[PDB]
Design a protein around this ligand. Sequence first.
Ligand SMILES: C[C@H]1Cc2ccccc2N1NC(=O)c1ccc(Cl)c(S(N)(=O)=O)c1
Ligand SMILES: [Hg+2]
Ligand SMILES: [Zn+2]
Length: 256
Amino acid sequence: HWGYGKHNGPEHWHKDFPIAKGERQSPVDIDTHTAKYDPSLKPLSVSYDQATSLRILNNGHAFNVEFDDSQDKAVLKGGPLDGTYRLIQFHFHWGSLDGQGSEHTVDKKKYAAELHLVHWNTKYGDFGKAVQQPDGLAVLGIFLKVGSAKPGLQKVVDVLDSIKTKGKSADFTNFDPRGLLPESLDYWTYPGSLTTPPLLECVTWIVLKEPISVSSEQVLKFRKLNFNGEGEPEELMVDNWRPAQPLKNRQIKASF
Ligand SMILES: C[C@H]1Cc2ccccc2N1NC(=O)c1ccc(Cl)c(S(N)(=O)=O)c1
Ligand SMILES: [Hg+2]
Ligand SMILES: [Zn+2]
């Protein structure tokens, strides 16, 4: 099944998942000079005060912090979005080297990594029904750069030990995702897709302009994770990122 290697990577996904070549695929290059400041766009509202994390899983491509999403607690609304969207999970995409890893790029610039907080549209009942809808998901993309430690990431950094290999999960309660946000909520927005298979075209993307900084030691630990399961030849979880895809007529809008 799919991966990020020479024989199962992004260039191979289209065969099992035809939509890999579809009309609204992610990620894309954000051409900052072509993106249009949109005044019809209400301010963003990120409300993570009640967010209830349950666990962190190595899924064989990334690790997911998962959230209790059967009540309205950690919610995204405002900006490009109509109604409310509930936080289901967060995860990252990173490189082997500081010079790559982000999925979205900004005037062709690849950041060291990118965080996705994944939210689903409440009017659709649950995650599984939302991903059948064109406005089913909202993902908040946040860029990572290597510099100072991000304090609010360190609790994730240290549990990674427990979930080195594919399949492993660990209890991960009381994590506050607010720690992971930059100061400014300025963003770009476009209609797009999951960046992994099934690659469903159900996402409103909201990519924040201001990266967070993480430390070199922080990113390094990310890179100690494994693509293989326990007992297998060791493939190191690096370069788990899809490259930029064709914009295709679509317009990216700036919130600023
Ligand atoms: C392990 C698989 C299986 C699965 C099931 C439900 C939700 C996410 C999810 N997975 N992982 C993802 O990384 C994922 C899910 C949704 C999205 Cl919107 C994205 S992403 N990369 O467009 O932000 C990733
Ligand atoms: Hg969809
Ligand atoms: Zn992602």
